[PDB]
């Protein structure tokens with residue numbers, strides 16, 4: 001992996017079937033007619049898992065690479081199915097900016113809201129909107145109506161909704177055009193120009209993040225698998241610092257105790273790296289651990305730079321039924337799921353002696369006790385889900401134990 005341009009992590013979010021995967025595929029084809037380094041990815045190359053073919057939806061987050069003239073992108077395509085929100089969050093947790101896909105035909109839908117909300121509670125700082133399937137919507141009035149709703153929906157979850165770029169296009173027709181002529185450059189085709197229009201927005205609207213490569217190494221693990229000839233790979237986006245082959249690193253969280261290992265390889269999009277730095281989306285080849293000894297939700301950290309915790313105080317907003325949350329309140333003993341970056345863990349809600357009940361729409365402080373240790377830190381935003389439903393959004397305010 002030779003690096004020439006700044007690197008940025010983007011991805012696709014939005015409601016089920018709105019066209020996130022098709023857009024992703026389209027992006028690779030369009031980009032590759034300019035930059036020959038870009039490897040094109042077909043629809044089936046992205047939704048490739050047997051279970052994805054079987055069920056006809058995206059299930060796993062896929063990582064595709066493309067590039068523009070200005071920057072190198074790692075793109076994380078997420079599922080929109082309500083049942084795979086867990087995966088969407090882990091994808092979003094790797095994004096420096098997200099492309100919210102919204103179908104012009106259907107308008108914003110329940111996971112349009114939930115994905116914006118969750119993107120925030122995993123720190124996604126910027127959103128561009130791609131209004132898709134415009135080739136099915138003749139009436140300009142609705143298109144304006146759809147934009148209006150999306151811009152306002154973003155304003156609710158504290159995104160500059162009146163400001164975000166909203167690119168109107170058709171992911172399918174661009175992708176069809178690139179299939180008919182892969183050498184199709186900018187300007188020759190109106191649909192392919194809409195993708196360029198999207199690419200331009202990402203280039204200019206989504207800024208390259210400030211990344212501290214001097215702080216202790218920290219990579220939240222998004223995934224773990226086995227490379228047949230090499231070993232166990234933990235993947236993820238390096239949050240800070242650097243990792244080289246030969247470094248001792250600690251696997252932190254989700255197990256009773258931390259374990260140390262030696263990095264024996266580092267790869268970004270299958271091209272081996274010498275070193276991995278903050279921002280990079282890498283695979284870290286770990287030694288002496290099977291894929292049963294590392295998992296999604298743990299972090300790789302500079303040995304002893306991080307202490308996992310189980311108990312904290314949070315400032316929490318409980319969603320209203322209208323925002324897709326609970327219809328009724330909960331008491332102490334409520335045992336929902338908590339999502340921090342790529343981590344997902346059961347915790348126990350313990351309210352203050354005065355507080356007997358927490359109602360939807362309430363802002364409240366309580367203390368949470370997790371059933372496994374996790375890499376936490378003051379100020380870390382998180383999400384609460386339970387019963388296939390996002391119920392709350394909070395932030396750690398004080399680490400207790």
Ligand SMILES: Nc1nc2c(ncn2[C@@H]2O[C@H](COP(=O)(O)OP(=O)(O)NP(=O)(O)O)[C@@H](O)[C@H]2O)c(=O)[nH]1
Nearest residue numbers: 016017018019020021022057058080133170171172
């Ligand atoms: N007419 C039209 N159909 C489109 C367009 N983009 C996608 N579609 C169709 O919409 C369907 C869903 O597209 P897909 O990319 O799978 O959506 P998704 O958002 O990735 N779904 P999921 O939430 O499962 O990941 C497919 O049948 C696809 O062909 C478009 O621009 N125009």
Ligand SMILES: [Mg+2]
Nearest residue numbers: 020021058078
């Ligand atoms: Mg998809």
Ligand SMILES: [N+]
Nearest residue numbers: 046047060062
């Ligand atoms: N996928």
